[PDB]
Amino acid sequence: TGLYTLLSGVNRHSTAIGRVWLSVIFIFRIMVLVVAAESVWGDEKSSFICNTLQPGCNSVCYDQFFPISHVRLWSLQLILVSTPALLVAMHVAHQQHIEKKMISGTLWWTYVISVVFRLLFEAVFMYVFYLLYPGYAMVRLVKCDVYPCPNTVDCFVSRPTEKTVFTVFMLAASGICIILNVAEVVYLIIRAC
Amino acid sequence: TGLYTLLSGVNRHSTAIGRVWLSVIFIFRIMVLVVAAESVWGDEKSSFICNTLQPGCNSVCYDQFFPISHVRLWSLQLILVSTPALLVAMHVAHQQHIEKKMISGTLWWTYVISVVFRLLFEAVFMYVFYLLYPGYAMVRLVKCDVYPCPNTVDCFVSRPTEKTVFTVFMLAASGICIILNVAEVVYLIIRAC
Numbered sequence: 001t002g003l004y005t006l007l008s009g010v011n012r013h014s015t016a017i018g019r020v021w022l023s024v025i026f027i028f029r030i031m032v033l034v035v036a037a038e039s040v041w042g043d044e045k046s047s048f049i050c051n052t053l054q055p056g057c058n059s060v061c062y063d064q065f066f067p068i069s070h071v072r073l074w075s076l077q078l079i080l081v082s083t084p085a086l087l088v089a090m091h092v093a094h095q096q097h098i099e100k101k102m103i104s105g106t107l108w109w110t111y112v113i114s115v116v117f118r119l120l121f122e123a124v125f126m127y128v129f130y131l132l133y134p135g136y137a138m139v140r141l142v143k144c145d146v147y148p149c150p151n152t153v154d155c156f157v158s159r160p161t162e163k164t165v166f167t168v169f170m171l172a173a174s175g176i177c178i179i180l181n182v183a184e185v186v187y188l189i190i191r192a193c
Numbered sequence: 194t195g196l197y198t199l200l201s202g203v204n205r206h207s208t209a210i211g212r213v214w215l216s217v218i219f220i221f222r223i224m225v226l227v228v229a230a231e232s233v234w235g236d237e238k239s240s241f242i243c244n245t246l247q248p249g250c251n252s253v254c255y256d257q258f259f260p261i262s263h264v265r266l267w268s269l270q271l272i273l274v275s276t277p278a279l280l281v282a283m284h285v286a287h288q289q290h291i292e293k294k295m296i297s298g299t300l301w302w303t304y305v306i307s308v309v310f311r312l313l314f315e316a317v318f319m320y321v322f323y324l325l326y327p328g329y330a331m332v333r334l335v336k337c338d339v340y341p342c343p344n345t346v347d348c349f350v351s352r353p354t355e356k357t358v359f360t361v362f363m364l365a366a367s368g369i370c371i372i373l374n375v376a377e378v379v380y381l382i383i384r385a386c
Contacts, residue, residue: 053248054247054248055246150341
């Protein structure tokens with residue numbers, strides 16, 4: 001869990017919000033993603049079927065309706081969100097090594113910049129999820145007319161309801177993280193002056 | 194066999210060529226067609242297969258390469274060739290009935306016109322066979338690119354060699370019939386003057 005708290009962005013300049021609340025939500029998202037990765041999204045493509053005899057229609061319809069899986073989007077979001085925290089940690093380690101082999105304002109500015117970047121990454125991933133999948137709910141039946149499928153064919157999705165439940169969980173966690181990051185930057189600015 | 198000789202065109206004005214030679218060739222063609230109709234052309238479409246998974250490609254390729262079967266063409270040719278003979282026979286019966294209830298030149302002209310029409314029908318059927326199937330030989334493998342078949346597919350024909358043999362027999366018989374009809378009209382014209 002120490003690696004997770006390091007990836008969250010815990011810093012010596014962090015207040016209570018960034019040290020005890022943001023890290024817990026980060027670990028919660030990690031755990032939910034680990035639980036839901038291969039259990040429920042494992043057979044997303046192998047169980048995807050369409051009512052047709054046309055060869056190759058299943059693959060093209062699946063690619064049309066799922067350009068990128070939800071789990072991969074969440075994994076990329078977590079990696080990109082955790083990147084600035086470890087960047088700051090490596091910078092701190094470099095500064096301490098330089099001190100050993102031989103100010104606070106630089107640390108403060110680095111922390112606020114990293115928090116802003118985390119907020120930006122979370123916001124852009126929320127926006128791209130909204131673009132790709134406008135509704136939080138997943139439907140049982142989809143209509144596909146991509147070549148080489150003739151006319152329009154019916155295709156059926158695996159586990160729509162469980163995927164909807166996990167999507168709601170993940171979106172709520174991301175929204176809470178965005179709100180907490182905004183509160184963190186506002187609190188730091190207020191404490192500055 | 195009497196019905197066959199009636200359908201050949203035997204008339205009281207017929208010479209030896211039309212009475213003993215043409216009728217025999219007509220009966221020979223009838224017998225060969227009866228032998229070859231369903232024995233060798235029976236499974237022409239059910240055994241026609243193509244190397245593909247595309248639904249509907251077998252039927253469209255068969256229709257593209259065999260617009261009308263050889264056996265049906267020969268049957269239509271025989272029916273149309275035999276039509277003028279029975280037309281003449283019915284006209285003779287009508288004339289005899291009119292005589293009973295109450296010249297030779299009319300009979301002579303009707304006979305020559307019927308022979309000319311038989312020659313024309315045989316010639317046009319030979320020409321249409323040449324148009325549809327330029328080569329007398331049938332090939333084992335054909336290349337088909339008709340929609341919905343993707344790209345070009347290989348399709349295989351049933352009994353190409355036996356069909357080639359029977360085609361040669363039928364074409365030779367038809368050519369002999371054409372030559373005999375031309376000889377008949379020339380001989381009748383010569384005897385006229």
